[PDB]
Design a protein around this nucleic acid. Structure first.
Lengths: 55, 110, 102
RNA sequence: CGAAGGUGUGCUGUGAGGCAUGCUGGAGGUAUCAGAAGUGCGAAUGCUGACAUAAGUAACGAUAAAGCGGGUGAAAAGCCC
RNA sequence: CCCGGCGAGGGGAGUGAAAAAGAACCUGAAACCGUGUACGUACAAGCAGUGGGAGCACGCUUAGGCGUGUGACUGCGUACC
């Protein structure tokens, strides 16, 4: 099955009106090192909730 | 004062790069870097490199201050396409397009 | 034969160096000459570790069209034209303003 | 002291059209009256090149199968031990 | 000289009459794809225009008008070969 008429750029945009991405609302700050990280994740230096976990 | 940076002939589709470009339009540079660091897309790496280059140009060639800069313009345009061949069943051949784009970032202190 | 030869004194007829004087250094096959102190250009030279040569911006001479220079006549202080004739058994050049051998 | 060509504005004839000028371009153009034609395109499932739509959709080629530690590197599910 | 992987790509300085003449290099049309500004659009039914016509934004102004853009609401109206 295939189309009988060619769709328009207006219709293309209307369909694409649901494709926008979402950004992270905010980041968290560790209590000993001051780094920024994703909530419930460890930091790039190896801290979580004030304690060094990974050397 | 305004400062430009560009990446020409980048290996990606403009439709795919515009999704990431729409996230940082009109933001402060620090906020924009924080937004780009936590987006799980391939276009984010390219856009981040271009933004960093623009900040460096503004510091070195114009004597600007980092804490006053904002992303005043950003856009993506289509480049040339490469043409390739892919075989199908019963001896029929198809065409493949490999698309590219140009990326422009403008930072300003006003 | 040729009217302009190496080691001659010439005056420039056209260009940005119009009116200057100099000496011919060498003659190229395409119809061009190199004259000392005339038609200078600036070149951006890349360095090369071999040959112990560094880079920099250098000033050198560039070739100029042969028909844009003339032969200088010190007796008159003016440009001139050149002709050919046989004198003893040999060919010679001569000035056309006063019919004097060069 | 700015030709052809490109792109806007104003005026003008019943029409095919004409004239003037701003920006771009960087060396050619041609009155009047006569003369000769490869002389005017939207269609021919016309011919050649470029670019759209369907769509960021189908698919990534045998259902023998992978897990972990170290190394290198800007980056390692796939490279080396 | 500077950002970047001793990258691809870019921003300055310098050459030249000119670098949107930078090697993907005279001029640079159209299809097609974007960023910004003004006005319209979420109780409304069809070849998408034509006649009538408020409201908003903007430029002259002889303060009397007019020009340009958009166009709620309403009569008529089923492409071309």
């Amino acid at each position: 099955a295939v189309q009988q008429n060619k769709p328009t750029r207006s219709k293309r945009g209307m369909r694409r009106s649901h494709d926008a991405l979402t950004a992270v609302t905010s980041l968290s700050v560790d209590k000993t090192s001051g780094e920024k990280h994703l909530r419930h994740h460890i930091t790039a230096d190896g801290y979580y909730r004030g304690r060094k976990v990974i050397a | 004062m305004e400062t430009i940076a560009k990446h020409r002939h980048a290996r990606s589709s403009a439709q795919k790069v515009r999704l990431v470009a729409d996230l940082i339009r009109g933001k402060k540079v620090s906020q924009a870097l924080d937004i780009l660091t936590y987006t799980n897309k391939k276009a984010a790496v390219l856009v981040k490199k271009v933004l960093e280059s623009a900040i460096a140009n503004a510091e070195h060639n114009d004597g600007a201050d980092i804490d006053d800069l904002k992303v005043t313009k950003i856009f993506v345009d289509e480049g040339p396409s490469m043409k390739r061949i892919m075989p199908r069943a019963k001896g029929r051949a198809d065409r493949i397009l490999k698309r590219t784009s140009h990326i422009t970032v403008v930072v300003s202190d006003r | 034969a040729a009217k302009i030869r190496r080691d001659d004194e010439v005056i420039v007829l056209t260009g940005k160096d119009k009116g200057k004087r100099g000496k011919v250094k060498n003659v190229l096959s395409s119809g061009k000459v190199i004259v000392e102190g005339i038609n200078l250009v600036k070149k951006h030279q890349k360095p090369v570790p071999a040959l112990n040569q560094p880079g920099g911006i250098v000033e050198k001479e560039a070739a100029i069209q042969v028909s844009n220079v003339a032969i200088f006549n010190a007796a008159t202080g003016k440009a001139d034209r050149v002709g050919f004739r046989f004198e003893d058994g040999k060919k010679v050049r001569f000035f056309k303003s006063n019919s004097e051998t060069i």
